[PDB]
Design a protein around this nucleic acid. Sequence first.
DNA 1: GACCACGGCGCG
DNA 2: AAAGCGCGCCGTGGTC
Length: 532
Amino acid sequence: ALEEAPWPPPEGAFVGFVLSRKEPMWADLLALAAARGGRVHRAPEPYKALRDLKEARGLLAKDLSVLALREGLGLPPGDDPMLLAYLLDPSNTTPEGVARRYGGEWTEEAGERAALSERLFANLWGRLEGEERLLWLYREVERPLSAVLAHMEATGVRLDVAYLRALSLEVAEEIARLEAEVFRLAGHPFNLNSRDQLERVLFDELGLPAIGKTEKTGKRSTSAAVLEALREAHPIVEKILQYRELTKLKSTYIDPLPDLIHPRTGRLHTRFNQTATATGRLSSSDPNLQNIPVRTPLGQRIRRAFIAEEGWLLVALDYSQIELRVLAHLSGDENLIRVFQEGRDIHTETASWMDPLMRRAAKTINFGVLYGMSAHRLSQELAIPYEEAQAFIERYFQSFPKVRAWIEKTLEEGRRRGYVETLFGRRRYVPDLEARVKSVREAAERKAFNMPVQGTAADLMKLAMVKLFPRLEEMGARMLLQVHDELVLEAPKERAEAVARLAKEVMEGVYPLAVPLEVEVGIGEDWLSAKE
DNA sequence: GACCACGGCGCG
DNA sequence: AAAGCGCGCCGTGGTC
Ligand SMILES: O=c1[nH]c2ccccc2n1[C@H]1C[C@H](O)[C@@H](COP(=O)(O)OP(=O)(O)OP(=O)(O)O)O1
Ligand SMILES: [Mg+2]
Ligand SMILES: [Mg+2]
Ligand SMILES: [Mn+2]
Ligand SMILES: [Mn+2]
């Protein structure tokens, strides 16, 4: 039954706020409230009232801190019950669910939100009493990380807009040429973007063999894997693949990115969602800057668009074979430890076995292999017979015997405890491990043993970001992007070299393992340059 | 306009 | 597509 108390609130109050739209960098601050000591404070003018707070503590703290940074204010995020709930159970991803689950309702009014924040925090902090590992992750990783992300989000990254505009006009001309071919070959026009219309053309009119069907609705699939299986079975398939690539990059990146430049900053701002994934990874959205193309020649042209402020350079740091090293440490496989203790590369060894484009393939291969891929799909990818695909799966695990033993212990443990955990104790609940439908059970198993490996690499990286960020600010350098095992920094030209050495070392020393973490670093005027 | 399910595909 | 995992956004297609 909170009481209206005059703004401002006492120091250390829980904040509620309402935004015109989810994106902090783009939102209007509609309302701002705070709660403390059995009272609620509703600010008369939200923007002015921001100045009174000294830290944002409450649901979605980082977002409001991001909006504060955009206004020239340094209001860092503090406690956020979402981070508590997320650590308790990573399926806790939204305030709607968290409130439903731990004792309130997520409404649209800042006061009730500030109130909700306060009681949700009490209750969750209660639930976390005694979970000392999760408390450690909260204090040493997540809560400090929120500040770092708020700064990355507010900073943004520079984009060569004029370049992409020109690229759009070029690519559009290429697409029209391929559309025309496809339409001719099909003997009539139709919407090449409609997978439904395409399917009737390929499998009914052209009478091509229907490899596979789609998951939910059982239509005949027109996916790249299926089209690749028909690249020589007919010429029109080939062009379809190329129309898909261009339209995919044009409509997802080339055309939308330029129109998202912020007016005040002149830069492009993503959101780094901190309670979004089941393994502990971050995600990026609005726009997603974690899937900017890079694997093909055209995508590379897109990456070139991401450039440094004049007088600065981008610094790109990227852990080598990160999840493999984690697997060595997690499992104890001596043969795999040695692989890394003596500077061996097995992403390059799976390339010649099966340059920069051939190494990306061995990356899809050795990772697909490792996480329970099927002999069937491996045979199909590598273009070899099923007989040969099983032997790359026999040897790939013969070499490193303790991995399978680790997989088993992990699954056995997740069955008893109902969850699996990373090196630091981050939990993921995986209930279907005792499912009586084999398929459902074995999916769960693949989810279960991947988590500690992907989630440990994410713990390490978050920790590296937490340690590295203070050093960058004191050097006048900036942290721009994180792509799971990678960081892009922006540095004044004359500090760029020292920043790279420093960041490389911080990341490599984040938390020593039974195997060394190695980092590749590069420096350049654009994101593509910085990774050569 | 808003929403959503689906197939599809980009990156890690 | 199939016994890899984790995401977010696209166009289409359908509703309200
Ligand atoms: O689960 C998959 N499937 C993948 C397919 C292609 C590429 C990576 C894949 N990964 C994950 C594993 C790891 O978390 C991260 C490493 O990211 P990448 O930088 O791409 O690879 P890498 O660390 O093995 O080696 P390298 O840095 O010398 O290139 O990506
Ligand atoms: Mg061209
Ligand atoms: Mg989906
Ligand atoms: Mn990488
Ligand atoms: Mn890497």
